[PDB]
Ligand binder design. Structure first.
Ligand SMILES: CC(C)C(=O)C(=O)O
Ligand SMILES: CC(C)C(=O)C(=O)O
Ligand SMILES: [Cl-]
Ligand SMILES: [Zn+2]
Ligand SMILES: [Zn+2]
Lengths: 577, 573
């Protein structure tokens, strides 16, 4: 059960703080400086540096992400993730651990043999240091034009004592023997341009002076140069303390590593304290060159640092991340298919709720921000979508990541979608729900329905549809023509058009009477099932009217699927007025 | 869709970095120093401080959390969250926005009238500065033994310009008139120990000198003392930049605010950049006294800072958070029930997978760690459960929060069919098809071949060659159809009437021995444009009774629907 803390307050605790000591066993845990070492970088510069360039990114979704899954990726899921990363713009991708996993070996073989690797992309493979594993790693990459061989071994104080029971020389030799084998194997495969990355695994549990010693010894074996640099990757394998301390450690390593001009300094933070993004950002300001992570923070336990958050955290402060996030929903859907794990509702940039506003005062402030941008754009003769984003409560324009701001209205088990379906049998398409909620913004079930009817169902001006004759060709792929009687602002008139179906025909007919309806989307569903059966149709259109253009939804309801579609078009035109 | 970045690399971009410029509109966004101001702090000290005591916590789950939910808390869920917060050890709890919401007003009344507030807990209520709203707030707290009245107004450069259209003096007067009204109402409600909190809302988009001026001016009205302090709560209403810059802001405020001994400096970070936890911790090292957050990071958009993460981040480094997390599963189950939102699988400390090791190598190292602990413990006559935790890959003993270490040893139909073929299958069709596919992993290319072979290709027993639709002109009139079909290869005419073309065609099929009833029907466009293709999905009961899906694809809404009926009839057989 949960036990209310009841111990004494600390000595010195202010009288305005009535908190009590808990009975958690805090004595089983020590401050970082005692667990590992004191890191004091008094002359640090990272606090005074603002990031002004994207780092070199490396995506490790196919390895660190993959092996953290409940269900590891099938061959199809691996290819889909790899193609997604390539398409987004990543140029270094860790594709697996091929010497430890036959499925990973076969994946690396498949991408090499089927020419799936672009010429500006370098695949990365992880291996432990045992000589036969290193050999198998090189075998896996046979025929690659280029590849990064990432070898690692654990250097932490704790692992040296309880896992390896070894001294400093012994654990360093594991790494330098690995490096020696890498040099020897690279000489055997002259057809591939080999590059190396070494990680002192569990770096954040390792003395910095020892980390430097091991990395330097590995570097002497590899003998990197400015034109062929080595990657030293410094993982927060477990995130052990606050991100400022990790940043201090990176700045120290960046200053003190030998042959620094021949080093690409790489960060690999995990999220055990929930501050992986902060560790990466402050560490990059501290002199790192490269960051390893996963899309949406997948990876061992709490995950690797989120590459989406890091990239969009640049974008939103005016630095190009050099990765495309223009359609974050596509990225999300692909990630969820590949990982079989959802992106949380509140995940930065991608989560369901992150461009939502529930508060009336927030919604009002957002509309004022939006209105003022449009006014300044009209004045300067510019597209508002190209102007400086100046909107309270929305860090970015959701349209810049392919999303839409959502002003959610509460209905007095609730919510517009749910009640529309239960009370009126309509399944509103998601973008319709958002549009309609914005109409309501500018509520009881009755009020909701009444607003829906006056907006989408009732209007009869400027366009009313009386009747029509549909002449559909009998044969597949044939033309449908329509003649319709309509009232335009009260006045009966006859219109004509043709199209691949009655919807298209009707749309084309209305163009001659001054309504340009460019159909963007369309959905239909049944309501009920017999002689009482009806169809509900929803049409999204960019509409322009004679005597500017607006994207709007129309709704139509009718016993015929054809007539419901036509009613929806009329509904859209009248919304646009 | 996603387009690979293809613009020129930056000048001076290193040879070893081949990344290209994206086409994202970065020029719509400015560095923080330009959007707001540069950092004013000389000789910061927060980078040299390690937290060594717990802050004063305030939980805003019942307000910031609650108002951010799609399903807001019932009165029962509210009491449950309140009691949870009390039992865990929280002493300040923001219980609502009662002047804006009758449900919050009724809840405040309820916990006061029922005598539900322990002697060491102070409730906190949120209000805007309008005088009528302050009155209503005090009415809600009538009879409270003590209460924090938290009043706020927005101070940021942006909101001053485009929300309020007001200058600095006017915006300061709103806060300061608010404070005066609070002082007035406090004198009219005797006995209650009134306490105040002021937030310059959107603080992170506000000039620091100005934020200081407003707070100082509010404080002059309230006249707090060291025994009766005021809370100045400085929110990252939007998280706008890196946590070090927030922390520099906090340290600056802590050093420059007037009457500092009579101020509890409070942080209220949101998570827009994923760094609220970091902002809080560095902010606390910067000299803040107090932190407002929600359990498991609930709240507007990306949420308020996570109280669980902050508290257990102290525990795991040897500092008592003064809050009990001994049973994090109870905490989580209650939070999930109250918020009706899940804790993510990877959420620090509480998520499903955070104490799981799938890697054989990690499992081995974990076991070596636990064994050496058991050796040191047998040798010292101690329980291992009281010994220093020393286990690779596990920052804490999962038992210390009621959990356990777990050494652990789905075709994607919807996604593949929508992504590769433009088809959004109705949920029940997804199920039907993905069981037919388990029976054959199947590649995407293999999956499509099977979809086509079941839904699109068959032409027996029913093939539809062509048809004439005679649609009623007027609404509500009849539609007739005449179609040329083949039954088991045999050309035959069928004909029928109904309320639309789809009904007419199903009734027509009755004459030929197929009794079809439309149970469900869905249709969607397959591209943009006033001409593109339609996908239709029909679920029908079909005798010569099996209930089956059909799929039709065609340039016309009408024809796609008819093909979907044919598809269904052929699956039935
Ligand atoms: C293999 C190494 C880089 C690792 O994943 C880690 O230390 O987290
Ligand atoms: C009311 C204020 C403190 C708020 O919730 C915020 O600024 O985030
Ligand atoms: Cl019909
Ligand atoms: Zn890792
Ligand atoms: Zn807030």
């Amino acid at each position: 059960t949960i036990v209310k803390p009841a111990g004494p307050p600390r000595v010195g605790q202010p009288s305005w703080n009535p908190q009590r000591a808990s009975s958690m066993p805090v004595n089983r845990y020590r401050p970082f400086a005692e667990e590992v070492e004191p890191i004091r970088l008094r002359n640090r510069t990272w606090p005074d540096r603002v990031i002004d360039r994207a780092p070199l990114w490396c995506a490790v979704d196919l390895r660190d992400g993959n092996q953290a899954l409940i269900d590891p990726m099938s061959p199809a899921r691996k290819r889909r993730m790899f193609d997604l990363l390539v398409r987004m713009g990543y140029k270094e991708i860790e594709v697996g651990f091929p010497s430890a996993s036959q499925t990973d070996f076969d994946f690396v073989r498949e991408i090499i043999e089927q020419g799936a690797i672009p010429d500006d992309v370098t695949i990365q493979v992880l291996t432990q240091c045992r000589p036969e594993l290193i050999e198998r790693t090189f075998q896996a990459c046979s025929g690659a034009p280029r590849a990064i061989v990432h070898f690692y071994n654990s250097t932490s104080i704790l692992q040296r004592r309880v896992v390896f029971r070894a001294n400093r020389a012994e654990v360093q030799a594991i790494a330098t023997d690995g490096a020696r084998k890498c040099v020897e194997q690279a000489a055997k495969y002259p057809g591939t341009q080999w590059r190396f990355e070494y990680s002192p695994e569990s770096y954040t549990g390792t003395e910095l002076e020892y980390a430097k010693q091991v990395c330097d010894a590995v570097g002497e074996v590899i003998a990197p140069t400015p034109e062929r640099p080595i990657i030293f990757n410094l993982p927060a394998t477990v995130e052990m303390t606050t991100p400022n301390v990790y940043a201090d450690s990176i700045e120290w390593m960046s200053r003190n590593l030998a042959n620094r001009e021949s080093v690409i300094l790489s960060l690999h933070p995990h999220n055990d304290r929930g501050t992986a993004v902060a560790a990466a950002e402050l560490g990059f300001a501290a002199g790192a060159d490269r960051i390893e992570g996963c899309l949406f923070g997948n990876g061992e336990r709490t995950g690797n640092v989120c590459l989406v958050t890091l990239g969009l955290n640049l974008f939103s402060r005016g630095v190009d991340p050099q990765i495309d996030f223009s359609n974050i929903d596509e990225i999300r859907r692909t990630v969820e298919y590949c990982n079989q794990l959802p992106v949380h509702e509140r995940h930065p940039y991608g989560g369901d709720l992150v461009y939502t506003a529930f508060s009336g005062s927030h919604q009002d402030a957002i509309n004022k921000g939006l209105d003022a941008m449009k006014l300044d754009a009209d004045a300067a003769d510019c597209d508002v979508d190209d102007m400086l984003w100046q909107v309270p409560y929305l860090p970015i324009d959701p349209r810049d990541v392919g999303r839409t701001y959502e002003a959610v209205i509460r209905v007095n088990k609730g919510g517009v979608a749910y009640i529309m379906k239960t009370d009126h049998g309509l399944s509103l398409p998601r973008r319709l729900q958002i549009e309609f909620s914005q109409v309501i913004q500018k509520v009881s079930p009755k009020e909701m329905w009444d607003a829906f009817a006056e907006e989408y169902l009732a209007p009869v001006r400027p366009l009313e549809r009386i009747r029509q004759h549909v002449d559909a060709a009998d044969d597949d792929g044939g033309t449908t023509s329509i003649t319709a009687t309509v009232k335009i602002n009260g006045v009966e008139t006859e219109i004509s058009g043709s199209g691949n179906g009655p919807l298209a025909a009707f749309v084309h007919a209305l163009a001659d009477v001054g309504f340009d309806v460019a159909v963007l989307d369309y959905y239909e569903h049944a309501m009920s099932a017999g002689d009482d059966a009806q169809a509900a149709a929803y049409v999204e259109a960019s509409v322009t009217i004679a005597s500017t253009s607006k994207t709007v939804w129309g709704v139509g309801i009718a016993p015929s699927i054809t007539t419901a579609s036509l009613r929806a078009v009329v509904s859209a035109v009248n919304r646009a007025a």
